[PDB]
């Protein structure tokens, strides 16, 4: 929309208050003009029809409960865009400042969120297994990173190239969460998952096994559900990613940790310079070793710890 840039206030899914960039043209729109070509938030009004309507508010105050997911979706997109830009120097997910569009209240009691190739979609959950998904910032950056993958490596969504796709999005979703200092961990969806249980989460990076995910290549899932287990084998890469940063002994294999700033940067490079659409786990390892060597040298500690971590997970 064409209008004046302003700032409004709303309450998020967790009852947290914040300011969000909006645009004024008779109504106050969830349109942020300060980031690239902008961030747009739409109202899917419980239908499956996308994007649906650009969000319109009459007073710039988003305190109604119906408003909560649009607030968080909008805002969390805004810090994710900022992490990318400030930390890897990328403008938007395409590297050119493309507009970020998000739709909230999609379907009725939809337990999930996704990147559809051109926009992000968030359901509201059944209110028991999940609460509105835009409420978890790691969910929101996990989603945006899928945009980012699509425009860089383009990892096909199935088998090992698809589990690497899903681990990237969980690795930067977790880096974005530490980036904002929003109570970070090495867990996925913990903030939006099972409102009645405490301490649980969708997946764990620190211990994928907690919830049953392989934490070793020899545990790899070979059937068919979930596109050859995209969201299952992703744990092998999350564990590896977890060891490089923090360090540790997995299966008798010790890893000295190099920290997360360096984990983010060896990964963003592997992802943008060496990954292809068909890359497998053995290729991800070459690629990460090659980026680590690119940045820290052949004989670095960093180079050594990525080796150790893929060795500990059984990758190659
Ligand atoms: C529930 C699972 N969805 C995801 O992991 C997600 C979504 C998600 C939701 C909440 C928190 C974190 C992540 C996903 O990969 N979206 O791209 C899923 O898609 N499982 C496939 C089997 O089931
Ligand atoms: Ca209002
Ligand atoms: Ca957290
Ligand atoms: Ca988390
Ligand atoms: Ca819970
Ligand atoms: Zn995903």
From Swiss-Prot:
Ca(2+) 4 binds at residues 193-194, 197, 200. It is found in: Secreted. GO terms for biological process: proteolysis. Zn(2+) binds at residues 142, 146, 166. Binds 4 Ca(2+) ions per subunit. The keyword Metal-binding applies. The keyword Nucleotidyltransferase does not apply. Its cofactor is Ca(2+); Zn(2+). This is Thermolysin. It comes from Bacillus thermoproteolyticus. The lineage of its organism: Bacteria, Bacillati, Bacillota, Bacilli, Bacillales. The chain holds residues 233 to 548 of 548 of the full protein.
């Amino acid at each position: 929309i064409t209008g004046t840039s302003t700032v409004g206030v709303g309450r998020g899914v967790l009852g947290d208050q914040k300011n969000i960039n909006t645009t004024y043209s008779t109504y106050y729109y969830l349109q942020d003009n300060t980031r690239g070509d902008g961030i747009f938030t739409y109202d899917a009004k419980y239908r499956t029809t996308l994007p649906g309507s650009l969000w319109a508010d009459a007073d710039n105050q988003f305190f109604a409960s119906y408003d909560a997911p649009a607030v968080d979706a909008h805002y969390y997109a805004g810090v994710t865009y900022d992490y990318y830009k400030n930390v890897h120097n990328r403008l938007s997910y395409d590297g050119n400042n493309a507009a970020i569009r998000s739709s909230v209240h999609y379907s009725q009691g939809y337990n999930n969120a996704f990147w559809n190739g051109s926009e992000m979609v968030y359901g509201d959950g059944d209110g028991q297994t999940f609460i509105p998904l835009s409420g978890g910032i790691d969910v929101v950056a996990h989603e945006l990173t899928h945009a980012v993958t699509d425009y860089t490596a383009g990892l096909i969504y199935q088998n090992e190239s698809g589990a690497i796709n899903e681990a990237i999005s969980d690795i930067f979703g977790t880096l974005v969460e530490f980036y904002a200092n929003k109570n970070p961990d090495w867990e996925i969806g913990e903030d939006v998952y099972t409102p009645g249980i405490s301490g649980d989460s969708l997946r764990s990076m620190s211990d994928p096994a907690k919830y049953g995910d392989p934490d070793h290549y020899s545990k790899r899932y070979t059937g068919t559900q979930d596109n050859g287990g995209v969201h299952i084998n992703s744990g092998i890469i999350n564990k590896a990613a977890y060891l490089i940063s923090q360090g540790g002994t997995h299966y008798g294999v010790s890893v000295v940790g190099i920290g997360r700033d360096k984990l983010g940067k060896i990964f963003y490079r592997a992802l943008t310079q060496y990954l292809t659409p068909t890359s497998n786990f053995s290729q991800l390892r070459a690629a990460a070793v090659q980026s680590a060597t690119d940045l820290y040298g052949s004989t670095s500690q960093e180079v050594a710890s990525v080796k150790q971590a893929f060795d500990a997970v059984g990758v190659k």
